[PDB]
Design a protein around this ligand. Structure first.
Ligand SMILES: COc1cc2nc(CN3CCc4sccc4C3)[nH]c(=O)c2cc1OC
Lengths: 826, 247, 319
């Protein structure tokens, strides 16, 4: 078996959702911001948000909504986790003591159902009579909000429309009414039903079905003065309400998909709309009052306000303040002004909240020679792309390097005192036949530049037609200075060439240090790329020189330096190249028993391969023979997102389901079959998407002073900006910390009353297993925050099993020291 | 695709056994003794009739590729029955086959098994499988005797007498190389043909074509009377060489 | 000739890797040196010496040289390790069963979470599977371990049934003692949970119906670790075993011993309301508690869902 320890170095920074209401007091306006597994509560002031409380939950926050049922003084909070843990929460404050009350809770998972494409949707009735949940295709789940439903029991109503895009409860109906857009073979439609708690079924809805735009994306519930709904698409915005129908199709919204909306005026007159290119729009509802006294919707208008970060969620606060919640870039507070500035913009940024964004790749480098190590991360996407330099100093110091284009891979080349970074920028087919970039960015603002002139694929004779307005990716290699972080050089790869892999190394007997890039020719027609290059570059005297190119028959997804040789994965093949005295790559040997060799890691003569659907394989280079040999494979099927080698026998992997596992050589030589079987010894639900594993640590350890029990250091970056650390334990230390977790889980009160053991259980749609081999360090590190009475309760009847102290009963102060030592690894 | 398992009578003059100086009478005796050994041993173990026959067919085919002077027959027989049990889903442990073989064979005969009987048998399985070319599925005259007779309608007692007499003839033919000359279907009609002659029954009357004198032709097409008689001659020869009489 | 198996040496294949671990050996992927065809080699270790050649392999060699069908896996030949020329006794070399190579297995396409099946894809999949099962069931063979792992899929959309290690013949005239623990619990029929031991070809139909549901939910329908727990889960959806819906349930050994918590009503149509009607009828008939009332393979092929499907339009699963 294996024993490992996992802790968070940086908590998730991406904003998954944001709501505003009256949660902490019936009087204050609060902004609740949801990051993965983290809930942040702020109090809205006119100068700026005031932080009041932060809690963690043992689950990914999927739905977050505030409601105030009749009889309550203040808003209550509904949350549903991605594992279907539901709960209703209340803020309660006793002077200085702030706590979160779990008013109702339960798990709403169905034994039989198909998870929907557009994900979990949660909405609440305007009269707070029920919570609507869309979890599975063909089913609508109703949790009625009666006082007695403390377990959140619910029932399912059969839904004929299997493919639902979005749903909202409508305002101003005689009965609870849902409005939704659905897709069937005839296109997309908008339809209504009434929800009957008494009959537990749908009744005919207030207005008839209307055919809508093919890419109708979002449904807006319009408040009582108007009533009805607005439907946002790619090209058009429409309003529906019984007999009334409006449509505005301003060409400005066609350029970029609109992804988020928020109501500004409670009456419903103004809405904020945001799009993927970061534009902020005002949607205006122009009113007309008849002599009858009735208020009708005359027309719709859209006005561009300015530019914000690419926002997953928008919330208007007060005055002109809007919270721009970003998952791809930095979250922001922006001021909306009545008068435009001299550039024509009405938006003026106030504060910028750091988001490590998606961490596509990262490397650890000791820039200042301080025997520490700093983390340079490829963070963000599109106009939010950046390079983030992170060091420890008690908070983490982060320096932001903007790129305004997507960073894909980073590697450090010390000889050249610079980083190599692979990037891609979006251009659009224009009337010239070429393409035009939407904004200047790193690859275009380089001091010196070059473009590949390779003739390898030039024979073409394969037609790829272009339509005006279509997007393309343009890939580059950026040479960036390690001190100024100034783009010294940018190399642009071929048209339709994707840069996928990057390494910096010396090969063979060649003393020169090269940048080597692996590419794939990507054409929309192809299911899998069938052409590719391995390109050797030399960065010398401010210019990048092309040294050699090797054509391959596939995508070079990953490369790694291997004992002076170049190990590269081309689709199914894993290949080892030698670097000749003629400065060309020469193939030595290949391995073909792979579906897609997405990831490669090496140690000694051993190679770890990560496959799209076959988990991990341990290969070895047999130098006596000049070939490869399969040492061991993990036969359990998993889809890999990243891999890392922990030691000669243990191997770490990350699943696309937000899970971690460790595989080991079965070390039993009785049969060959045992050695070929890697036994999954560790299973752990992380809750984050790990893109990059990287050996290193951010703390400045001489290791001459007391070394912590943990041994080894692997850092990992995730999609939600979370940075974590994995380290190994001895059998003695694992059992102590494990026995302690079980004790801590009995003592600590969870938000939503979510069992900790459930949360960390390995979870795919198909399987659920109890965690094994992993210590939730974030649980262990919470011992230092529980009350002194609670601490003593945890340490009762505890004995050790360490050989120095045969059996050692614990005191609270003894364990306070053990955990404090563990907090020093990060 | 599939191997050919049938030879001509003339070809049996050239088995390995014959060419190593064994005369025709001796090889025939060895075949009867080995087959009857398989039969008696399996009967002691309670084995289905198909399992006995399959072992016997494996045995007869084996000695079309090897000589009796280099492969002791009772070891081969025991191995055939052992494999046949697994093929036909009536498995037996090798030790139990040896136990029974010890009871039935005298000390000279059980000498063939050598110092370690189980080992000599288990070792042979590799050669047996390679020899029979991994073609394990075998059909036997019994199923056709029953399938064909089910289509006879008439005196219940005369037909049952026909079936049992023919069934006896099938059991006796396993001691011969007929398994190597003719497909089971021809053997089944032949045993029906012989019993009908011996009981003075006219089978055509019981067929759906009562004026079709060649009744076999609806069951097995293209079977000459010569083939059916050659088989009969060979079966009754066992009854004239030994001192038992046509049933 | 092509028929003289057991002699050709495994030298004739370049081993590419180990695709899986089998019951009697480890399964390797190999390229034929002469033709270039990719094959799958199953290693048979006879070195065990306790009972010689494994009977699980004997069943697969006996049955798969008889069965010819597009949806039944094909055994191309049997090859051997370099044998010892001097002595036949010393030789312990193993034997390899050559099969056609298949790109993936259904469990893998599903466990990795990558594949999305449309109705038409499920039609082309089930039509091939049931057609193969009919060929086998008409030849009086029982598969006896139908699982997602044992359904091999090509990228083109061809399906082949594969692991015939527990396959045996069925006789209507003679009820025979069989092993009452054949199909894996998730796909095991209710009849065998109560231990029938004398079962119909319907055992395999139940499994294929479980797969039909799993193709629509992307999650296995009846997942449990204990035989009683499975009976309860099946009972919740298909209804509790009772004399009215399954008259002869009383003749089953464990009917009094094994009991669901309640006598649950059948809710199959309700819980699978999202499944198309043409398919839902198939599922209700395939997941029928009573083996004598459970539909046959042929009846599934003459169903509104699968009858008018064209195998020429083998629409590939979305990959
Ligand atoms: C033991 O049953 C069998 C399973 C089989 N699975 C596959 C799928 N592979 C595709 C390539 C790879 S790389 C690692 C795992 C995988 C699975 N392909 C086969 O040809 C095959 C043949 C079999 O028996 C004859």
């Amino acid at each position: 078996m294996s024993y490992n320890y996992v802790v968070t170095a940086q908590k998730p920074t991406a904003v998954n959702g944001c709501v505003t209401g009256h949660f902490t007091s019936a009087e204050d306006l609060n902004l609740l911001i949801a990051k993965n597994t983290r809930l942040e509560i702020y109090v809205v002031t006119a100068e700026g948000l005031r932080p009041v409380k932060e809690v963690g939950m043992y689950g990914k926050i999927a739905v977050m909504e505030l409601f105030r049922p009749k009889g309550e003084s203040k808003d209550l909070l509904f949350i549903l986790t991605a594992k279907y843990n539901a709960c209703i929460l209340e803020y309660k404050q006793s002077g200085e003591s702030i706590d979160i009350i779990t008013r109702a809770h339960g798990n709403v998972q169905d034994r039989i159902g198909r998870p929907s494409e557009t994900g979990i949707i949660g909405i609440i009735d305007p009269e707070c009579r029920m919570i609507g949940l869309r979890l599975y295709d063909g089913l609508f789940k109703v949790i009625p909000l009666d006082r007695d439903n403390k377990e959140l029991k619910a029932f399912n109503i059969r839904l004929e429309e299997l493919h639902v895009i979005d749903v909202k409860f409508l305002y101003g109906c005689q009965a609870p009414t849902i409005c939704f857009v659905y897709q069937d073979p005839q296109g997309r439609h908008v339809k209504t039903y009434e929800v009957s708690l008494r009959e537990k079924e749908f009744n005919k809805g207030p207005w008839k079905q209307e055919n809508v735009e093919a890419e109708a994306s979002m449904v807006i519930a319009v408040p009582e003065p108007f009533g009805g709904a607005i439907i946002i698409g790619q090209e058009s915005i429409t309003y529906h309400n019984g007999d009334k129908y409006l449509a505005i199709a301003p060409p400005i919204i066609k350029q970029s998909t609109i992804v988020c909306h928020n109501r500004v005026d409670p009456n419903g007159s103004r809405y904020l709309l945001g799009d993927m290119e970061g534009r902020l729009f005002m949607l205006l509802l122009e009113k007309e009052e008849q002599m009858d006294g009735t208020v009708t919707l005359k027309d719709l208008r859209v006005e561009l306000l300015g530019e914000t970060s690419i926002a997953e969620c928008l919330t208007y606060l007060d005055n002109g303040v809007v919270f721009v919640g970003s998952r791809l870039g930095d979250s922001q507070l922006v001021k909306l002004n009545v008068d435009s500035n001299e550039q024509g913009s009405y938006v003026v940024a106030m504060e910028t909240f750091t988001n490590l964004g998606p961490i596509v790749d990262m490397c650890v480098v000791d820039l200042e020679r301080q025997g520490q190590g700093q983390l340079v991360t490829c963070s963000g996407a599109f106009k939010e792309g950046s390079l983030r330099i992170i060091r420890n100093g008690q908070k983490l110091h982060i320096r932001t390097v903007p790129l305004y284009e997507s960073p894909r891979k980073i590697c450090y080349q010390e000889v050249s005192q610079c980083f190599g970074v692979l990037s891609s920028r979006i251009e659009v087919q224009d009337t010239s036949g070429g393409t035009t970039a939407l904004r200047p960015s790193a690859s275009t603002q380089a001091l010196s530049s070059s473009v590949s002139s390779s003739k390898l694929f030039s024979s073409s004779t394969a037609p790829h037609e272009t339509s005006f307005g279509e997007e393309v990716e343009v890939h580059n290699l950026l040479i960036i200075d390690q001190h100024t972080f100034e783009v010294l050089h940018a190399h642009q790869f071929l048209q339709n060439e994707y840069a996928l892999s990057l390494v910096s190394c010396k090969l063979g007997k060649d003393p020169n240090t090269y940048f080597i890039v692996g590419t794939a020719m990507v054409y929309p027609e192809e299911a899998e790329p069938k052409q590719g290059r391995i390109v050797v570059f030399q960065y010398s005297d401010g210019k990048l020189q092309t040294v050699a190119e090797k054509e391959v028959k596939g995508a070079v997804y990953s490369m790694v330096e291997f004992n002076g040789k170049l190990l590269a994965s081309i689709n199914s093949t894993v290949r080892l190249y030698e670097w000749t005295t003629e400065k060309e790559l020469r193939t030595e040997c290949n391995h073909y028993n792979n579906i897609m060799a997405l990831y490669l890691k090496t140690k000694g003569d051993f190679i770890l391969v990560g496959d799209l659907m076959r988990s991990v394989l341990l290969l070895a280079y047999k130098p006596m023979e000049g070939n490869f040999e399969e040492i061991a494979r993990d036969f359990n099927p998993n889809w890999m997102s990243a891999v890392e080698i922990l030691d000669d026998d243990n191997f770490l992997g990350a699943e696309n389901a937000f899970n971690l596992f460790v595989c080991q050589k079965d070390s039993a030589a009785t049969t060959d079959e045992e050695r070929q079987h890697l036994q999954e010894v560790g299973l752990f639900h992380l809750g984050e998407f790990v893109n990059v594993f990287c050996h290193g640590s951010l703390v400045m350890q001489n290791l001459g002073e007391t070394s912590t029990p943990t041994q080894g250091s692997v850092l990992f970056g995730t999609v939600n900006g979370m940075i974590g650390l994995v380290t190994s334990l001895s059998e003695s230390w694992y059992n102590l910390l494990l026995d302690m977790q079980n004790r801590l889980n009995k003592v600590i009160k969870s938000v939503g009353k979510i069992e900790h053991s459930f949360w960390r259980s390995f979870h795919t749609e198909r399987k659920t297993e109890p965690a094994t081999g992993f210590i939730d360090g974030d649980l262990i590190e919470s011992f230092l925050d529980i009350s002194r009475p609670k601490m003593q309760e945890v340490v009762a009847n505890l004995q050790y099993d360490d050989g120095s102290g045969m059996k050692r009963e614990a005191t609270a102060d003894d364990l306070i020291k053990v955990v404090e030592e563990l907090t020093r690894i990060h | 695709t599939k191997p050919c398992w049938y030879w001509d009578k003339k070809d049996l003059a050239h088995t390995p056994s014959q060419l190593e100086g064994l005369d025709p009478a001796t090889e025939a005796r060895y075949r009867r003794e080995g087959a009857r050994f398989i039969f008696d041993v399996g009967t002691r173990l309670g084995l289905h009739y198909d399992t006995l026959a399959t072992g016997i067919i494996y045995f007869h085919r084996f000695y079309m590729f090897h000589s009796f002077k280099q492969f002791p027959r009772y070891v081969t027989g025991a191995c055939c029955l052992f494999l046949a049990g697994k093929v036909e889903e009536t498995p037996k442990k090798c030790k139990d086959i040896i136990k029974t073989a010890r009871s039935l064979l005298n000390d000279v005969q059980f000498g063939q098994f050598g110092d370690d009987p189980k080992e000599e048998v288990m070792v042979l399985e590799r050669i047996l499988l390679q020899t029979i070319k991994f073609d394990l599925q075998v059909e036997h005259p019994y199923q056709f005797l029953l399938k064909y007779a089910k289509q006879l309608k008439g005196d219940k007692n005369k037909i049952q007498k026909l079936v049992q007499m023919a069934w006896t003839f099938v059991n006796d033919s396993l001691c011969t190389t007929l398994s190597l000359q003719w497909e089971p279907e021809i053997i089944a009609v032949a045993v029906m043909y012989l019993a009908g002659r011996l009981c003075k029954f006219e089978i055509q009357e019981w067929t759906s074509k009562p004026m079709y004198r060649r009744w076999w032709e609806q069951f097995v097409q293209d079977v000459p009377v010569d083939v059916l008689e050659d088989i009969c001659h060979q079966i009754l020869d066992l009854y004239s060489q030994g001192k038992q009489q046509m049933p | 000739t092509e028929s003289d198996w057991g002699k050709r040496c495994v030298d004739k294949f370049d081993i590419i890797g180990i695709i899986g671990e089998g019951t009697y050996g480890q399964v390797y992927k190999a390229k034929d040196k002469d033709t270039g065809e990719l094959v799958a080699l199953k290693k048979v270790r006879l070195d065990n010496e306790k009972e010689g050649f494994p009977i699980t392999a004997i069943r697969e060699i006996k049955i798969l040289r008889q069965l010819i069908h597009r949806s039944v896996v094909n055994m191309k030949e049997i090859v051997t390790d370099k044998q010892d020329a001097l002595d036949f006794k010393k030789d312990k070399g193993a034997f390899y069963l050559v099969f056609e190579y298949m790109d993936h297995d259904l469990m893998g396409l599903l466990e990795s979470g990558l594949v999305h099946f449309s109705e038409d894809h499920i039609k082309s999949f089930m039509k091939q599977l049931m057609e193969g099962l009919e060929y086998c069931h008409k030849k009086n063979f029982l598969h006896r371990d139908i699982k997602c792992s044992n359904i091999l899929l090509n990228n083109s959309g061809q399906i082949k049934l594969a692991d015939f290690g527990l396959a045996r013949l069925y006789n209507s005239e003679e009820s025979r003692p069989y092993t009452n623990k054949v199909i894996t619990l998730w796909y095991r029929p209710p009849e065998l949970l109560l231990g029938e031991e004398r079962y119909t070809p319907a055992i395999d139909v139940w499994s294929c119906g479980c797969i039909l549901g799993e193709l629509f939910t992307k999650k296995p329908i009846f997942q449990a670790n204990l035989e009683l727990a499975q009976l309860e889960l099946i009972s919740r959806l298909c209804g509790s075993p009772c004399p009215a819906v399954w008259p002869d349930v009383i003749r089953l050994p464990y009917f009094n011993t094994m009991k669901p918590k309640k006598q649950y009503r059948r809710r199959l149509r309700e819980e699978f309301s999202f499944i198309p009607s043409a398919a839902l009828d198939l599922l209700d008939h395939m997941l029928t508690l009573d083996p004598s009332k459970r539909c046959t393979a042929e009846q599934t092929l003459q169903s509104d869902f699968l009858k008018d499907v064209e195998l020429s339009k083998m629409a590939p699963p979305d990959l």
